[PDB]
Amino acid sequence: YAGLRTPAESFGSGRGQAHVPKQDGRARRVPQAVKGRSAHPPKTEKDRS
Amino acid sequence: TELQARGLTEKTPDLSDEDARLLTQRHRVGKPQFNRQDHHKKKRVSTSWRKPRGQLSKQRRGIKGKGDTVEAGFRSPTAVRGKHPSGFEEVRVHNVDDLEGVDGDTEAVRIASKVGARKRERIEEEAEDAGIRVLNPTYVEV
Amino acid sequence: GISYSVEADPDTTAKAMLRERQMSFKHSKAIAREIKGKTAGEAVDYLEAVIEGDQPVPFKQHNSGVGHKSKVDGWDAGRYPEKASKAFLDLLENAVGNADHQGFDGEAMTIKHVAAHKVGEQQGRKPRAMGRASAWNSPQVDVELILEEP
Amino acid sequence: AEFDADVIVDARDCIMGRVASQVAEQALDGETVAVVNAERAVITGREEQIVEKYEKRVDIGNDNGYFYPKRPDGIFKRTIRGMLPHKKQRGREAFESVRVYLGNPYDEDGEVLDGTSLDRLSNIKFVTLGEISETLGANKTW
RNA sequence: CGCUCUAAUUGGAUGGAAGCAGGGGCGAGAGCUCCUGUGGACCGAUUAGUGACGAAAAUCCUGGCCAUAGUAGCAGCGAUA
RNA sequence: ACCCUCAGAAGGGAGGCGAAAUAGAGCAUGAAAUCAGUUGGCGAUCGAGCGACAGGGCAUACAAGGUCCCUUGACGAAUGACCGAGACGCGAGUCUCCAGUAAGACUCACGGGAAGCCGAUGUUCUGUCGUACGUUUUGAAAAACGAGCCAGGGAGUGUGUC
Numbered sequence: 085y086a087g088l089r090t091p092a093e094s095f096g097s098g099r100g101q102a103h104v105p106k107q108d109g110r111a112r113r114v115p116q117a118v119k120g121r122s123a124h125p126p127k128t129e130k131d132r133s
Numbered sequence: 134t135e136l137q138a139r140g141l142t143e144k145t146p147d148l149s150d151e152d153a154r155l156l157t158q159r160h161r162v163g164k165p166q167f168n169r170q171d172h173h174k175k176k177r178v179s180t181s182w183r184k185p186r187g188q189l190s191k192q193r194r195g196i197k198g199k200g201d202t203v204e205a206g207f208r209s210p211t212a213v214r215g216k217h218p219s220g221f222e223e224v225r226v227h228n229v230d231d232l233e234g235v236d237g238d239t240e241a242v243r244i245a246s247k248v249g250a251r252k253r254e255r256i257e258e259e260a261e262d263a264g265i266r267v268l269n270p271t272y273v274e275v
Numbered sequence: 276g277i278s279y280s281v282e283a284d285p286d287t288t289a290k291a292m293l294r295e296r297q298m299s300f301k302h303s304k305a306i307a308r309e310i311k312g313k314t315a316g317e318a319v320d321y322l323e324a325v326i327e328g329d330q331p332v333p334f335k336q337h338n339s340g341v342g343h344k345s346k347v348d349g350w351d352a353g354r355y356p357e358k359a360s361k362a363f364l365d366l367l368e369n370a371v372g373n374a375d376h377q378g379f380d381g382e383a384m385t386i387k388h389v390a391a392h393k394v395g396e397q398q399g400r401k402p403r404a405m406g407r408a409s410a411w412n413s414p415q416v417d418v419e420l421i422l423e424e425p
Numbered sequence: 426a427e428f429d430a431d432v433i434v435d436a437r438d439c440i441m442g443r444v445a446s447q448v449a450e451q452a453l454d455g456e457t458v459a460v461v462n463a464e465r466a467v468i469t470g471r472e473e474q475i476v477e478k479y480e481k482r483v484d485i486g487n488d489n490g491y492f493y494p495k496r497p498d499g500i501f502k503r504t505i506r507g508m509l510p511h512k513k514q515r516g517r518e519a520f521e522s523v524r525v526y527l528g529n530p531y532d533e534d535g536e537v538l539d540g541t542s543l544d545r546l547s548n549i550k551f552v553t554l555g556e557i558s559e560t561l562g563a564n565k566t567w
Numbered sequence: 568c569g570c571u572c573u574a575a576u577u578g579g580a581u582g583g584a585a586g587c588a589g590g591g592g593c594g595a596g597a598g599c600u601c602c603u604g605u606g607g608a609c610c611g612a613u614u615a616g617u618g619a620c621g622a623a624a625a626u627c628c629u630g631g632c633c634a635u636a637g638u639a640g641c642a643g644c645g646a647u648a
Numbered sequence: 649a650c651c652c653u654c655a656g657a658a659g660g661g662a663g664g665c666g667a668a669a670u671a672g673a674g675c676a677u678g679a680a681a682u683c684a685g686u687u688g689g690c691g692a693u694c695g696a697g698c699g700a701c702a703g704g705g706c707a708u709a710c711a712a713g714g715u716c717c718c719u720u721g722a723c724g725a726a727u728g729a730c731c732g733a734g735a736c737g738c739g740a741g742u743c744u745c746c747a748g749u750a751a752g753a754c755u756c757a758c759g760g761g762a763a764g765c766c767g768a769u770g771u772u773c774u775g776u777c778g779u780a781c782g783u784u785u786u787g788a789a790a791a792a793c794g795a796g797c798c799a800g801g802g803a804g805u806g807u808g809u810c
């Protein structure tokens with residue numbers, strides 16, 4: 085859940101801004117966002133044997 | 134009273150007629166800069182080479198004046214490829230034992246930058262005695 | 276902050292500096308530019324005339340909308356920035372004072388080097404219409420001065 | 426006021442374009458040229474159509490401007506400029522080393538360039554540069 | 568070709584490592600390497616692995632910054648001080 | 649610390665400590681965007697994808713590159729003469745011989761020379777070519793879409809089965 089603990093929403097078109105989820109005027113959740121989730125991170129489920 | 138480099142600084146390698154010809158060719162012909170397209174138009178775009186991928190790229194399309202695109206036809210002659218401008222083949226050296234097996238007639242040695250002054254002193258005197266030139270010599274007040 | 280950007284021979288030179296001055300950096304570039312090469316005493320008399328409004332400081336770079344001045348020679352736009360001028364007088368009072376304490380003739384020494392540097396901004400915020408606020412900052416200026424014997 | 430011309434061309438009864446073409450070529454070769462008796466230079470054709478073309482050039486223009494000369498002085502000078510890359514360094518230098526004159530301010534009589542002379546006994550359809558200028562409204566100062 | 572960390576084999580460093588700046592050499596090229604200054608403690612190579620491994624772009628994200636500009640506003644309100 | 653300066657527990661100057669204060673307090677290192685001063689080149693008569701490739705000016709401490717210029721001579725691919733002689737053509741001009749000769753890129757040798765001199769680097773001038781980049785598109789310089797600039801971040805991963 086790293087980076088997913090937020091209700092951030094995108095405003096959509098209208099304010100001259102990219103459609104990026106924001107919370108309190110700060111981008112969040114998405115991989116390109118600072119503090120956003122890791123797109124394809126290491127996983128515990130992986131068989132390393 | 135003056136600065137002089139240690140070692141056989143003036144030493145030149147002995148090359149076959151054909152190798153010297155090819156070495157002279159490489160020096161005469163040269164090659165284009167091969168810097169990345171439009172690196173000069175944007176500070177965030179560095180000089181490091183990247184194949185132009187744009188479908189409309191002028192350089193990719195081979196338009197005259199937009200710079201040469203990397204191709205195998207630009208390769209240097211096999212016989213001289215990689216040679217120091219002097220004609221010597223370089224041998225990377227880290228210690229005194231690395232000098233062993235080095236042909237001072239055909240190869241010159243380059244002491245890795247990380248090697249300290251104490252070890253360089255030993256390497257330099259031992260190289261000169263073996264008839265091997267040190268490309269990056271220490272300059273002492275002679 | 277800055278450090279002296281020019282070498283200075285202690286035996287024939289006097290130094291001085293202003294730190295984090297809250298004044299126009301643009302007025303500062305203009306003033307430095309104009310007093311360089313002058314005698315310490317000359318600069319003082321010049322700046323006092325500026326403060327009085329009898330002598331304009333040429334605004335060669337930051338001149339948008341600036342009205343022309345007849346006393347400006349070889350240029351047109353000029354103004355009378357008293358605040359930055361007063362700070363420069365403090366810089367000269369210090370320099371000339373340091374110079375005197377060292378044995379030199381402070382006033383007669385030439386301004387070998389004078390330069391302003393923007394060291395930062397005291398940040399501020401101005402409430403605007405539509406529930407929005409925008410920047411309302413104050414420049415912070417450092418300035419070096421090196422007096423040299425002539 | 427004095428012009429050290431290496432060549433002095435006499436334009437009297439000569440075809441302006443053919444002279445200009447040669448004067449352009451020579452000026453580009455480094456020669457300082459002086460065209461003399463411009464008012465007496467000539468252009469072949471039906472006077473009425475010739476005049477219309479030049480009158481049109483006078484009328485043409487706007488705020489940016491299209492300054493077209495009326496005197497035989499300038500007409501010829503401009504005709505030469507059109508045969509030179511006057512906006513390039515070499516072109517401008519050549520053009521500036523060329524000067525046209527009303528009458529002949531020199532002591533020497535100009536030389537007649539080959540293939541530029543017009544035989545009046547064999548031709549009736551042509552006009553004098555001076556005649557063109559008079560029609561254009563120029564002050565006959567020659 | 569380059570990046571991280573692991574392993575084996577093997578090297579460099581306070582007689583100055585990494586990094587940074589300017590500069591020299593090599594390679595078609597990815598990129599390798601040297602010199603000088605700064606820096607003041609770590610750093611490689613080969614082989615076999617490893618992978619939150621390579622950016623100019625997404626009205627991309629965050630931070631910093633220039634022009635805009637010494638410009639707009641600091642006048643307008645029946646309370647002109 | 650002390651002293652001088654100052655409205656002054658400010659700041660500045662001088663000075664002291666330490667290997668180092670450009671380790672002096674959000675103080676290891678200290679990139680880019682960018683700013684001040686300054687150096688080199690250009691510059692108030694001149695034209696705009698900013699360059700690539702050629703070639704000139706001016707500029708350059710060392711190091712890490714050491715080449716480069718002119719006489720002559722040797723070798724000499726394709727190509728390839730002038731002149732002269734003879735013969736044709738109304739004419740521009742052509743044929744035969746001289747001759748595949750002289751010439752002919754690179755490379756080398758002798759002799760002489762350069763050390764800002766050769767390379768290289770900065771800037772600028774000349775020539776040739778040249779309306780960014782990425783994307784959308786049959787067709788993009790596009791009056792189609794995106795970005796002010798820079799740094800850092802930013803997109804084929806795991807399990808199971810086949």
Ligand SMILES: [Cl-]
Nearest residue numbers: 204205208595
């Ligand atoms: Cl290959």
Ligand SMILES: [Cl-]
Nearest residue numbers: 300301393414
């Ligand atoms: Cl400012």
Ligand SMILES: [Cl-]
Nearest residue numbers: 486487490491
């Ligand atoms: Cl007009």
Ligand SMILES: [Cl-]
Nearest residue numbers: 510511512513
């Ligand atoms: Cl032109």
Ligand SMILES: [Cl-]
Nearest residue numbers: 547548549550
């Ligand atoms: Cl006729």
Ligand SMILES: [Cl-]
Nearest residue numbers: 154158754755
């Ligand atoms: Cl060859």
Ligand SMILES: [Cl-]
Nearest residue numbers: 124803804805
């Ligand atoms: Cl993939």
Ligand SMILES: [Mg+2]
Nearest residue numbers: 086087119120
């Ligand atoms: Mg996170």
Ligand SMILES: [Mg+2]
Nearest residue numbers: 172175176178
């Ligand atoms: Mg760039």
Ligand SMILES: [Mg+2]
Nearest residue numbers: 339340341342
């Ligand atoms: Mg105004």
Ligand SMILES: [Mg+2]
Nearest residue numbers: 404405406407
């Ligand atoms: Mg409100």
Ligand SMILES: [Mg+2]
Nearest residue numbers: 576577613614
């Ligand atoms: Mg091994």
Ligand SMILES: [Mg+2]
Nearest residue numbers: 622623624782
């Ligand atoms: Mg891309």
Ligand SMILES: [Mg+2]
Nearest residue numbers: 628629630631
């Ligand atoms: Mg931003």
Ligand SMILES: [Mg+2]
Nearest residue numbers: 339340636638
């Ligand atoms: Mg405005």
Ligand SMILES: [Mg+2]
Nearest residue numbers: 645646647648
């Ligand atoms: Mg009242």
